[PDB]
Amino acid sequence: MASIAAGLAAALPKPKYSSEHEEPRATQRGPRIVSADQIDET
Amino acid sequence: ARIIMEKAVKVPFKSVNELADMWIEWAEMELRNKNFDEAVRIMAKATQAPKRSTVDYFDESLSPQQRVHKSWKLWSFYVDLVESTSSLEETRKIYERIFELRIATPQTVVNYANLLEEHHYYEESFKIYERGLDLFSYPVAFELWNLYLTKAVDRKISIERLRDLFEQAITDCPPKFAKVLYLMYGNLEEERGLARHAMRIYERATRAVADEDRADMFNFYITKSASNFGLASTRPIYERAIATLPDNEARDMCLKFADMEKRLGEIDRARAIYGHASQFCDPRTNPEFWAKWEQFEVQHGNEDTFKEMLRVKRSVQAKYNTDVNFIASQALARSQ
Amino acid sequence: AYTQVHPEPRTWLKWAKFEEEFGTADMVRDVFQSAIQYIAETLGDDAVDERLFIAFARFETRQKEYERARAIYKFGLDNLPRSRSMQLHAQYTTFEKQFGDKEGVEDVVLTKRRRLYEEQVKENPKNYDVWFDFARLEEMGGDPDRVREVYERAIAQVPPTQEKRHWRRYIFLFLFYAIWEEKDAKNIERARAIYDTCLNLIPHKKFTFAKVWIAKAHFEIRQGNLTAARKTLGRAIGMCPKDKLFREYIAIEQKLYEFDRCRTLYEKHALFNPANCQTWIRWAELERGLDDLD
Amino acid sequence: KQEPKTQEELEEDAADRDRRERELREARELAER
Amino acid sequence: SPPRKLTAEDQEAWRIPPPVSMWKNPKGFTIPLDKRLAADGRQLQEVQ
Amino acid sequence: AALKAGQMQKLREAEQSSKRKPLILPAPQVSDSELDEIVKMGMIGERA
Amino acid sequence: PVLQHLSLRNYDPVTRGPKLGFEAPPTENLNTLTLEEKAAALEAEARRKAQEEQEAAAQARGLDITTLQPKKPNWDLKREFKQRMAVLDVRTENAIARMVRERLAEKK
Amino acid sequence: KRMKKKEAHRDDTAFRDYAREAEKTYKRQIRNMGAPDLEKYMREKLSAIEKAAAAGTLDIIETEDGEMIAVDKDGTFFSTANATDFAQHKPDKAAVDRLVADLRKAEEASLKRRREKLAKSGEEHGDVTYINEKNKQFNAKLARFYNKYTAEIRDSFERGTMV
Ligand SMILES: O=P(O)(O)O[C@H]1[C@H](OP(=O)(O)O)[C@H](OP(=O)(O)O)[C@H](OP(=O)(O)O)[C@@H](OP(=O)(O)O)[C@H]1OP(=O)(O)O
Fold this sequence. Notes:
This is part of a larger assembly, with 2 copies of chain A, 1 copy of chain B, 1 copy of chain C, 2 copies of chain D, 1 copy of chain G and 1 copy of chain H. By secondary structure, chain A is mainly alpha-helical. Chain A contains 2 helices and 1 strand. Helix content of chain D is 58%, strand content 0%. Chain D is rod-shaped, with a radius of gyration of 16 Å. The longest helix of chain H is centred in the middle third of the chain and has 30 residues. Bound molecules: inositol hexakisphosphate. The site of inositol hexakisphosphate has 6 residues of chain C, from α12 and α14. The PDB classes it as splicing/rna. Keywords: Spilceosome, DHX15, DHX35, gpatch1, splicing/RNA, SPLICING-RNA complex.
């Protein structure tokens, strides 16, 4: 039913600048404290 | 010498200016013993940075090695060096990297556009002007608009395209620059469009100029409308101006309107205009206005209209016979 | 949680700005796609906001994804109503002026000015200079059926006032429809139909127009229809004589270098008004060149 | 003194020049095909 | 339910004029005469 | 006196900007049509 | 060698830094008139012509036709009209020329 | 951004409702505290990490990358909501002093505005139209409301004539 969202995702080309190696644009002063959701995820 | 500049770079100097001076010293050394490719790659190593870095230049908490990549001394040196010792595409890439690093300046927008115009890329020059125009908001975008609009009119692009540009500047011109922009929009409309369109542009101008320049803009509108059309067509401009303007401006425009109507020969209309201005004007602060109405009545009138004029004059004196107007009149009398 | 409670474009755009500062470009894109999808699935596909589309395209422009930005702008303009994609089109125009090629620049400026003039006509159907400017816009665009439809709507905008001061510009609009379908469309039969409909619509009993008479006279001269041109101007003379009409056909026959027909025309102008010293002097000089001194 | 009007080819845009040379090169390559 | 979002124009539209009575003066105030005659419509009243 | 005069004059200007009344002009005896034939006769005479 | 191998557009060699637009605007380096120098010329011309017109009327006394209606109605209309027929007048002139050639050659 | 912020404050000066006044007051109070001490915040964070690790509500784990990841078994590390011991945070004496001095500063500024407005109301420019202070205040309120309707009658009382 999400026709306009699907059409947008179809019409958009892939980004020509790679982003798979991108860290967050502002780092978090660790240590990371997260939950059992991230236990399950990792 | 190469390794001694290398460890000079590796030294953490006390200031980004010091590290800037050492990097340009290395470049100057190679340029002295001319190695232009090596000097370019040394400046590239100097200004190497991530794609989307926003390191604060004045941050005295990170290393100068980290935060000399956003130094504007290095980038000015680098772009001029590439411009002199390389090609247009390489210089263009350096300019785009400055624009991405967001240390670009309207001077740099104009320099980039001038480089493309000297290499005869007029449309690319226009594109760079557009990029600078949405990078700087308005009161600096006016400097860019000055140069861009003159260059576009000189290049003589399509009239609808030029109309779009002028509406784009007029969208959020402050009044201070709106006078200039509206004058040139009307000038372009006269030289390459239709004078009716130029007149409606001047009407919007009279609405949208500053309060300092509003009477001047109304007078400009009246003169150009009298040149391009009839005085009967300059009548409603006079009516709108004397309906909207402040007190002194309305007095002056009523006097001009009455003179124009007397010149056309409508003595009764001139009398009505003089009566309106007589309502608005206090005799002890407008002696020249009352003298002008006396001149009009002795050149066109009889003693019945003259005694009507004096009845109106002393009625206006009675109306303005207040303490506030006394303060204002005494201040003006002992200031003159 | 905030977008679940307050799903407005305002809060989605705040999230997108947050992720542009503190996240990755992939998460900015995910926030924008989730906003488009959420507002689509709740409010309907035409109720997604041009503010979302503009901000997504501007983020990609910041990322230097010019193709992605162009795709976002084009998709939003194609899938939104124009009354609520006004500002999307304005941003698209500025985008193409910044980064597009030249043909894209006049394409988007053509669409923008076409919509502006359409709004101006929708307010005032009788603004003749607006009609002339949108006429020239369509001629410079070069879409022939569009230009013909624009001129046909302009013709159908008949001035209800019978004042010749408005009929100047209206007949002049007929003159430009003729000039376009003589010089660009090269439709001679259509130009003849233009002139015939103009002659039908002019109230010749009150006022005739030497502009259109001259224009179609020279048009039929260019076509080569001597007899038709002479018949039309003779019908003009028998309908309503005019000083400019007589002077211009005298000049045309003088350039034509014939003698007998222009002699008859000089006689007709003398019959209409014997006081035209210009025509008397011109006929006398022509006879002097003819060396019929008697 | 009347200024001599040296008629430059009313300035040809370098993008148009590059398009012209690219398209004539492509026409030459099509002739080669 | 969540509070109504009001504007300064809503506040101005519901501000209430200070009543000057033509009969009563419990505190014995001295009211300026323009303020005393403001609420009279007999200045408004037109006779043809 | 200067500061009370500035506040004073701003108040008086707000008054006067409200206090203005329109201008009723008499209908001109020579209207645009007879302007058109008088300019037609004038240009005819000067071209003669 | 530095001052001849740099382009000297953004760099300032005597201060060893970037060139400032506060001191040397690029409007100095321009070969043309900016929008404000232009349009200020327009304001000056307008006030000059207005003063000239009022002193001309005052040396004169009243209405003349050439200032009651100085440019003909629809003059922009007629100007852009003949600008659009800057070509078809030449073509109909050549039509008259060839028609004259035809008639004279038929007579001869 | 600066000038749009200044323009927004100028437009938002006038009263709209108490929700806007509360939001403005909170934002101004956050600005007046200024930048938080992230060093003290991080010291408290690490002390809470080791204390909750000792108390068994935090698991220190190492993933395939060999890094310290803390896992809150409950969700009560960051917030004392859902914490059964939320009522035994005894605040620091310096914190209590800082809050008290904040409130004392607010009190002083209100008293200072009270003094200033009493002085400017005690000043009298022009004609006395009142007979006591409450009358003066009421006449000033009347002028604030009604002067836009009584200007012609006021001109008549000044000059002596006309409607
Ligand atoms: O042909 P029309 O639409 O009826 O108007 C014409 C046109 O003048 P306009 O440009 O003011 O409309 C004529 O030709 P031009 O002046 O444009 O060259 C002019 O002819 P003359 O030059 O001989 O004066 C005169 O025609 P005429 O004077 O013979 O009537 C005039 O007619 P009207 O203004 O009276 O309509």
